[PDB]
Design an enzyme around this catalytic site. Structure first.
Site, PDB file in Angstrom:
ATOM      1  N   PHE A 119       9.844  -6.186  92.474  1.00 31.88           N
ATOM      2  CA  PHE A 119       8.719  -6.511  93.425  1.00 31.88           C
ATOM      3  C   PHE A 119       9.100  -7.213  94.842  1.00 31.88           C
ATOM      4  CE2 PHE A 119       3.989  -7.006  93.406  1.00 31.88           C
ATOM      5  CZ  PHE A 119       3.586  -5.891  92.669  1.00 31.88           C
ATOM      6  N   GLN A 240      -2.946 -13.215 103.973  1.00 32.73           N
ATOM      7  CA  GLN A 240      -2.064 -12.240 103.401  1.00 32.73           C
ATOM      8  C   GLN A 240      -2.570 -10.925 103.896  1.00 32.73           C
ATOM      9  OE1 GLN A 240       0.249 -11.179  99.337  1.00 32.73           O
ATOM     10  NE2 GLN A 240       0.870 -12.496 100.897  1.00 32.73           N
ATOM     11  N   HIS A 242      -1.569  -7.062 103.049  1.00 29.03           N
ATOM     12  CA  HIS A 242      -0.639  -6.544 102.150  1.00 29.03           C
ATOM     13  C   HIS A 242      -0.371  -5.138 103.088  1.00 29.03           C
ATOM     14  CE1 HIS A 242       0.762  -3.973  98.961  1.00 29.03           C
ATOM     15  NE2 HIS A 242       0.474  -4.864  98.301  1.00 29.03           N
ATOM     16  N   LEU A 252      -6.059  -0.576  98.159  1.00 28.43           N
ATOM     17  CA  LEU A 252      -4.728  -0.847  98.276  1.00 28.43           C
ATOM     18  C   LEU A 252      -3.889   0.159  97.006  1.00 28.43           C
ATOM     19  CD1 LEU A 252      -2.530  -3.305  97.857  1.00 28.43           C
ATOM     20  CD2 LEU A 252      -3.169  -3.235  95.459  1.00 28.43           C
ATOM     21  N   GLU A 255       2.513  -2.548  95.396  1.00 31.83           N
ATOM     22  CA  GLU A 255       3.947  -3.065  95.894  1.00 31.83           C
ATOM     23  C   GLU A 255       4.770  -2.349  94.841  1.00 31.83           C
ATOM     24  OE1 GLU A 255       4.782  -6.394  98.614  1.00 31.83           O
ATOM     25  OE2 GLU A 255       5.555  -7.278  96.710  1.00 31.83           O
ATOM     26  N   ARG A 286       5.902 -10.033 102.123  1.00 31.68           N
ATOM     27  CA  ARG A 286       4.873  -9.211 102.709  1.00 31.68           C
ATOM     28  C   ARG A 286       4.345  -9.318 104.152  1.00 31.68           C
ATOM     29  NH1 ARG A 286       0.689  -9.163  97.168  1.00 31.68           N
ATOM     30  NH2 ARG A 286       1.945  -7.325  96.490  1.00 31.68           N
ATOM     31  N   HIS A 354      -5.925  -8.951 102.366  1.00 34.28           N
ATOM     32  CA  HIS A 354      -5.739  -8.835 100.810  1.00 34.28           C
ATOM     33  C   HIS A 354      -5.893 -10.215 100.089  1.00 34.28           C
ATOM     34  CE1 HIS A 354      -3.864  -7.381  97.258  1.00 34.28           C
ATOM     35  NE2 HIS A 354      -3.007  -8.234  97.083  1.00 34.28           N
ATOM     36  N   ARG A 399       2.116 -15.568 100.157  1.00 27.20           N
ATOM     37  CA  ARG A 399       2.205 -15.412  98.699  1.00 27.20           C
ATOM     38  C   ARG A 399       3.134 -14.261  98.186  1.00 27.20           C
ATOM     39  NH1 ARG A 399       0.007 -12.164  94.492  1.00 27.20           N
ATOM     40  NH2 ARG A 399      -1.575 -11.419  96.252  1.00 27.20           N
TER      41      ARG A 399
END
Ligand SMILES: Cc1cc2nc3c(=O)[nH]c(=O)nc-3n(C[C@H](O)[C@H](O)[C@H](O)COP(=O)(O)OP(=O)(O)OC[C@H]3O[C@@H](n4cnc5c(N)ncnc54)[C@H](O)[C@@H]3O)c2cc1C
Ligand code: HEM
Ligand SMILES: CC1=C(C(=O)Nc2ccccc2)SCCO1
Ligand SMILES: O=C([O-])[C@H](O)C=C([O-])O
Ligand code: SF4
Ligand code: F3S
Ligand code: FES
Ligand code: NA
Lengths: 588, 238, 121, 105
Positions: A119, A240, A242, A252, A255, A286, A354, A399
């Site tokens: 990730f 954030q 994404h 979404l 990831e 990100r 996000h 994050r």
């Protein structure tokens, strides 16, 4: 009291991942606890979570919680409180293994252990080779988690008040939070939930933007409520975006696509991430992957189509067998909302709003913080916050993927573990007078009386558009100052906005109106914040201050609700079990 | 292009009984939208129209509706799949449940059957694991097609047997959940569970009508699940 | 007290649902049918005269109809009951696709038996 | 209990299927149905036994079936137990009336 009063030791406003771990934990500590939720607990946004939970279990390979602590501090662009990130990363493994014992249906390695996938921003040996520590159930991990925690709250006979909308916090005459007034959506009854601990667990606020991965219910309710009670919010400019939201839909894709081996292509077929982040590539941070896709479009190297401008996410090379087993959720999401089959052809994707990094400032205990006139931290007696509505802060400026689910479980549980010491520490609290409660109802009464004012639909559409244009991935002081001017205008319009449905039996219009107020304070707090921070850290990206300014802005920003100004709070850089990681230049 | 809807309305403070109201919506010709897009917009025109929704992506289970006669989720049913020449799009609440208001049903009884099957892991604590419970990918495979259930109610509110005995027959959704714990290798209480499903109604009111399967927005199969439950019940009590 | 949506005309029913409701009806019919068929058998056996009287009853066109219906319902209940039982022992899949298919093949096998029951009458 | 009901239905269904095979079998292969070959078929021990066996099977099979149907539709208790009384009595009559017919042939 001309309102019904329902007393508990603790009232948890919100039954998402973090609400439900907290409620469950408070309850097993032998304290009475009310769990509120404006939707049925399993419809909470956590259900939509996909990728997994990042945690040094060390099943896929030998791992170390310190490596994960490193990844996070760096990830945060050095404004994540390190005492907190230490607590989280270290506690993590036991806190998650606990869920597996609760029956959470994690995917498996051949030897029987919890599956862990690669990730964004994960490395062995403090910034070395690519790690895989995101534990997952296919790509339905949030669903798996939420449903398990609901089941656990069923097993444990938690008092759940499903489909009640919390209006506002009730303050006594000492400035302590002693519960909240709430509206029952089904019947229209309004009640005062009295408590010694009011725990805000109301998730994020993606709906302040035009395009967001967030559910319709993510209206920054906790931000509104806290601001109106004069409780500061923190780091509200950190939003954030994404990297891979579906183009033209906002839904979404995970990831875990890139984590399973997928990669981003531009119109010329160049794997542009190898240029932007030569080490981590498509599994970079990100905020970096976000900007990289935008720079690509912004210079004509993005593709178009019916979806609008986007980059491609190529997955077809992983084979049918692996996509249908590891990522079957995005398969359905892609076919439905993009009309694209990822087994044959790449998914269209554009950075989408996000996660809210900001929120109510808290201790590890979950206790909510304010500052005195001298700038020092003081605890807000009887108020607590956990989850996305919390700014602990373990995320700082950006994050890491799979760290939010960890956040929920670890701090939700912590708030419960520590609730008894927390009540004892704050002493007994004085009763709310009838005027104190009445004050919570002021907001709701305004809407119930305004028949002729403005259409809130247009006020909402104005708001979201304003944010999309002026406070997106890239920002400039010019557009941000003008964006803030319009928000002062839109916020005026809202003070005179009309509630068109007057009924009491399940009036969804009233709710969506009350939500809008919360959209407002959240958009405002973000806007005043992004203007104040004259540097570029993490998700926050200014053209007019493109440099990270570690000499002036190695801090949290704090919005003060009463005077509507800004101020700063220390980042914490004293971990208990290892030395701190010093700030250095952060590149992937 | 113009869309017409016939939509179920009811308010107990106003309406004597339920009624169908007519609605028109001007939509973009070259764009296809979801039913939920249409419902959201109709509430801009008529704010009194009440309905459940959240995730808008077919994961949370909020907006189960009877659309042109058949159960589904509004958020994932395209307008094009419903729209026919010279016929309205007919939107009504889920069948067999008490209507609270307009398109909102009291899910009470649906949850209550779910609660009845004890939908939580039950592990006696003997031979506890060092860390996580160890589950071979083989055994985890048995949970696929069961744990994905979103409690949307589409299946149960399309089952006649559930209509007739909503408080005695568990229903497809419930029974799916039951099987989700019956074959979990981490659940030790299998016998105890089965002994609580041995009566005439709990499981055996399912007659393979198969309404459940056809409507499932997540393409699960409660029939096959119930089949395996019956199997186990014969295995144990016959 | 609250209202419910149970207007059966406002609800689509797939072919397996139809197949099932007809199995339920065909059962209830076949229940009454046995009494009728026993009563007819009783007559047709009690004396040589009883039998001629029963052939005479069977000669009536109106009877020939009810008789064909009775035997059609029974033939249905049996074919669609065997489908059901095959599913229960794993000889048929429990997927929606294998459901539609066997239901139709049940209607075909029934019509064939319904005609042969017409021939016998 | 529920499991018992389930097996009994399916068992009797098998017995009854074998009986129908046997009845349709004779009917489709006898040609002219003269009183004499009709009584000859029904005076046969094999036929008498299989018939009553079948009649018992209908007692059990139909009773369960009817019960299932009634507990879906007839809700009020009084009326439901009355209909069950009629229905059972009827089925018991079927077996007894069956015993009378075939004992007298
Ligand atoms: C599509 C998607 C996938 C994601 N995947 C991951 C992932 O794989 N890993 C990861 O770490 N993070 C992931 N995230 C981030 C994720 O969104 C959050 O971190 C998390 O799931 C939300 O936690 P929460 O419990 O605080 O909020 P929520 O789950 O949204 O809970 C909000 C709750 O508060 C209640 N509430 C709100 N307002 C009121 C009110 N005023 N009165 C009473 N109750 C109220 C609601 O009823 C609701 O139950 C993902 C996010 C999205 C959008
Ligand atoms: C000969 C006299 C028969 C009578 C009077 C009769 C009657 C009935 C009745 C009243 C029911 C209630 C079912 C419902 O509610 O839908 C029923 C069910 C049933 N019948 Fe029969 N039937 C007979 C023969 C048969 C035969 C030969 C079979 C062979 C397959 C059969 C198969 C079944 C099955 C499997 C059920 C229950 C199905 C389920 O529970 O899902 N029947 N019958
Ligand atoms: C309960 C049941 C049936 C039934 O009652 N269904 C039904 C269908 C349509 C209309 C009313 C009832 S059909 C076969 C056995 O199972
Ligand atoms: O990629 C996802 O599934 C999701 O966006 C992940 C986190 O961690 O939030
Ligand atoms: S099986 Fe499907 S239709 Fe039934 S409740 Fe679960 S998700 Fe909904
Ligand atoms: S809708 Fe009902 S009858 Fe059985 S297979 Fe179906 S549960
Ligand atoms: S809106 Fe959540 S599933 Fe339709
Ligand atoms: Na947060």
């Amino acid at each position: 009291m001309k309102l019904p009063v329902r007393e508990f030791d603790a009232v948890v406003i919100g039954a998402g991942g973090a609400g439900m771990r907290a409620a469950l934990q408070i309850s097993q500590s032998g304290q009475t606890c009310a769990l509120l939720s404006k939707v049925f607990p399993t419809r909470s946004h956590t259900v939509s979570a996909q990728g997994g939970i990042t945690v040094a279990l060390g099943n896929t390979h030998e791992d170390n919680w310190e490596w994960h602590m490193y990844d996070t501090v760096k990830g945060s662009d050095y404004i994540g409180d390190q005492d907190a990130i230490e607590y989280m990363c270290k506690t993590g493994p036991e806190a998650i293994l606990e869920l597996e014992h609760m029956g959470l249906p994690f995917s498996r390695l051949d030897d029987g252990r919890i599956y862990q996938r690669p990730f964004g921003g994960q490395s062995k040996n403090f910034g070395g080779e690519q790690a895989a520590r995101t534990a997952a159930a296919a790509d339905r991990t949030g669903h798996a988690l939420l449903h398990t925690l609901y089941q656990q709250n069923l097993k444990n006979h938690t008092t759940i008040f499903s489909e009640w909308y919390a209006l506002d916090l009730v303050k006594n005459q000492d400035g302590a939070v002693v519960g909240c007034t709430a509206l029952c959506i089904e019947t229209g009854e309004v009640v005062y939930f009295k408590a010694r601990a009011t725990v805000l667990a109301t998730g994020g606020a993606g709906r302040i933007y035009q395009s967001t991965t967030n559910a319709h219910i993510n209206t920054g309710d906790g931000v509104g409520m806290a601001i109106r009670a004069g409780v500061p919010v923190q780091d509200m400019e950190m939003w954030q975006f994404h990297p891979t939201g579906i183009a033209g839909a906002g839904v979404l894709v995970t990831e875990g696509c890139r984590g399973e081996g997928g990669y981003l292509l531009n119109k010329h077929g160049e794997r542009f991430m190898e240029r932007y982040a030569p080490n981590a590539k498509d599994l970079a941070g990100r905020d970096v992957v976000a900007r990289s896709i935008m720079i690509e479009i912004r210079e004509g190297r993005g593709c178009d189509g019916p979806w609008g401008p986007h980059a491609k996410l190529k997955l077809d090379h992983l084979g049918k067998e692996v996509l249908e087993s590891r990522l079957p959720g995005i398969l359905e999401l892609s076919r439905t909302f993009a009309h694209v089959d990822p087994v044959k052809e790449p998914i269209p994707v554009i950075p989408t709003c996000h996660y809210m990094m900001g929120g109510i400032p808290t201790k590890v205990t979950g206790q909510a913080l304010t500052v005195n006139e001298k700038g020092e931290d003081v605890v807000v007696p009887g108020l607590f916050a956990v989850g996305e509505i919390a700014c602990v802060s373990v995320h700082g400026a950006n994050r890491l993927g799979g760290n939010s689910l960890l956040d929920l479980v670890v701090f939700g549980r912590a708030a419960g573990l520590h609730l008894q010491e927390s009540i004892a520490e704050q002493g007994a609290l004085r009763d709310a007078s009838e005027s104190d409660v009445e004050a919570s109802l002021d907001r709701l009464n305004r809407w119930n009386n305004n028949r002729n004012g403005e259409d809130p639909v247009a006020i909402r559409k104005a708001l979201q558009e304003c944010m999309q244009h002026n406070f997106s991935v890239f920002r400039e002081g010019d557009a941000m100052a003008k964006g803030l001017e319009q928000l002062k205008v839109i916020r005026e319009r809202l003070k005179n906005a009309r509630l068109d449905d007057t009924s009491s039996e399940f009036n969804t219009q009233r709710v969506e109106c009350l939500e809008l107020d919360n959209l407002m304070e959240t958009a405002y707090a973000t806007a005043v914040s992004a203007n104040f921070r004259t540097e570029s850290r993490g998700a926050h990206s200014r053209f007019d201050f493109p440099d990270r300014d570690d000499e002036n802005w190695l801090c949290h920003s704090l919005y003060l609700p009463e005077s509507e100004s800004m101020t700063r709070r220390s980042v914490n850089m004293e971990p208990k079990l290892r030395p701190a990681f010093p700030p250095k230049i952060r590149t992937y | 292009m113009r869309l017409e809807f016939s939509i179920y309305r009811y308010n107990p403070d106003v309406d004597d009984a339920p009624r169908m109201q007519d609605y028109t919506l001007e939509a973009d010709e070259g764009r296809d939208m979801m039913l939920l897009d249409a419902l959201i917009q109709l509430k801009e025109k008529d704010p009194s129209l009440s309905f459940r929704r959240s995730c808008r992506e077919g994961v949370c289970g909020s907006d189960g509706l009877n659309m042109n006669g058949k159960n589904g989720l509004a958020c994932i049913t395209p307008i094009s799949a419903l729209n026919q020449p010279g016929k309205k799009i007919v939107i009504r609440p889920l069948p067999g449940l008490p209507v609270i208001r307009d398109l909102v049903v009291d899910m009470g009884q649906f949850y209550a059957q779910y609660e009845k099957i004890k939908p939580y892991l039950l592990n006696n604590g003997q031979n506890p694991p060092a860390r996580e419970h160890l589950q071979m990918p083989e055994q985890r495979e048995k949970l696929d097609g069961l744990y994905e259930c979103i409690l949307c109610a589409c299946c149960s509110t399309s089952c006649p047997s559930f209509w007739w005995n909503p408080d005695k027959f568990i229903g497809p959704a419930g029974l799916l959940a039951a099987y989700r714990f019956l074959i979990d290798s981490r659940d030790t209480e299998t016998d105890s569970r089965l002994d609580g499903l041995s009566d005439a109604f709990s499981v055996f009111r399912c007659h393979s009508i198969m309404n459940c399967v056809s409507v499932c927005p997540k393409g699960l199969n409660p029939t096959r699940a119930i089949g395996h439950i019956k199997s186990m019940l014969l295995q144990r009590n016959a | 007290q609250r209202p419910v949506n149970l207007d059966l005309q406002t609800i689509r029913f797939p072919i397996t649902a139809i197949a099932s409701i007809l199995h339920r009806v065909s059962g209830v019919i076949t229940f009454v049918a046995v009494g009728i068929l026993l009563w007819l058998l009783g007559t047709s056996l009690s004396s040589p005269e009883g039998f001629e009287q029963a052939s005479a009853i069977m000669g009536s066109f109106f009877v020939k109809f009810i008789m064909w219906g009775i035997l059609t319902a029974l033939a249905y209940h049996v074919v669609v009951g065997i489908r059901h039982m095959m599913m229960d022992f794993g000889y048929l899949e429990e997927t929606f696709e294998a459901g539609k298919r066997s239901a139709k093949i049940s209607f075909v096998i029934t019509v064939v038996l319904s005609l042969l029951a017409g021939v016998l009458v | 209990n529920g499991v018992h009901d389930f097996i009994l239905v399916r068992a009797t269904a098998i017995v009854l299927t074998l009986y129908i095979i046997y009845m349709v079998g004779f009917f489709a292969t006898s040609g002219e149905l003269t009183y004499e070959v009709w009584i000859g078929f029904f005076a046969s021990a094999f036929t008498k036994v299989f018939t009553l066996l079948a009649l018992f099977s209908i007692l059990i099979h139909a009773w369960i079936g009817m019960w299932q149907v009634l507990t879906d539709f007839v809700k009020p208790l009084a009326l439901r137990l009355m209909l069950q009384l009629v229905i059972v009595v009827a089925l018991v009559v079927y077996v007894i009336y069956g015993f009378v017919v075939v004992w007298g042939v």
